Design a protein around this ligand. Sequence first.
Ligand SMILES: Cc1nc2c(c(C)c(C)n2Cc2cnn(C)c2)c(-c2ccc(Cl)cc2)c1[C@H](OC(C)(C)C)C(=O)O
Ligand SMILES: Cc1nc2c(c(C)c(C)n2Cc2cnn(C)c2)c(-c2ccc(Cl)cc2)c1[C@H](OC(C)(C)C)C(=O)O
Lengths: 132, 132
Amino acid sequence: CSPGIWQLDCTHLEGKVILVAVHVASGYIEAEVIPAETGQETAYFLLKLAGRWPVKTVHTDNGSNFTSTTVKAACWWAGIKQSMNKELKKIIGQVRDQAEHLKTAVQMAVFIHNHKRYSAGERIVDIIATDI
Amino acid sequence: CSPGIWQLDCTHLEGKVILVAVHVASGYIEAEVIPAETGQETAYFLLKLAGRWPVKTVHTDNGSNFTSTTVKAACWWAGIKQSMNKELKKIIGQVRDQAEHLKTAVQMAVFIHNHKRYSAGERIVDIIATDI
Ligand SMILES: Cc1nc2c(c(C)c(C)n2Cc2cnn(C)c2)c(-c2ccc(Cl)cc2)c1[C@H](OC(C)(C)C)C(=O)O
Ligand SMILES: Cc1nc2c(c(C)c(C)n2Cc2cnn(C)c2)c(-c2ccc(Cl)cc2)c1[C@H](OC(C)(C)C)C(=O)O
């Protein structure tokens, strides 16, 4: 798929919100725990993702998340335009005993996902690099 | 330089702590605002960085930051072993008026730094990909 398409969704676990970004063409994931499922957390997350990877278009399974003027401004500033969450939840449960806070287990699961085999982290760098 | 060497340092601005990670061979930066300059924030940051990029060795200008058992455990789990901050502070001041919170301005400055020209974000993907 195109090298700039990211899918972004907000999932739940242990009463907390986990925002999951997936590089469609590669399966590479960037996920974080946020205190609330607000537009301010989404906007701030998009600004982080955009500055680290080429984010050209963003898709979601809940269009209402991209309706806040806060989120639209972030998409405007970064020049952004408009399944996997169970695989991650699977990994989180496997490593959940190794961590106290859920945020730590989430990052443990992101590490495992991106580096497990080529791997998702290896495909994205090859895709983004090929396009360059 | 080697494709897995990252430099990590904790800088200050507006009474808050900004942790800055720099991919030595490329100049690519990942930076975030943390509430306090504690080992728990460092460890959690390392776990995030490691899961998104190949982090093999980490250097710092303050060795005492890597002495906490909390940080050493993160380095252990992720298989990690053991100038730029002014360029970023320069960009943060330029865009500071465009944001209320310092964390937003930091990510704005990371975006600008990595994508400004090849750019730092383009060199890192070419370096990591070449090594693959
Ligand atoms: C909350 C926490 N405290 C920790 C550690 C460690 C290793 C120590 C010694 N302590 C103090 C302690 C624990 N028990 N006692 C009696 C004292 C870790 C940790 C877990 C896995 C990895 Cl790879 C790396 C660090 C965490 C993790 O949180 C972060 C935010 C990452 C620090 C978490 O969520 O478990
Ligand atoms: C705190 C904040 N509130 C915001 C916005 C926006 C665009 C609106 C409308 N509001 C509500 C508002 C502001 N004034 N009034 C009277 C009502 C942004 C922002 C700034 C730059 C970008 Cl590219 C994208 C969003 C932020 C930033 O914080 C994050 C954590 C990113 C949300 C920040 O630090 O400025």
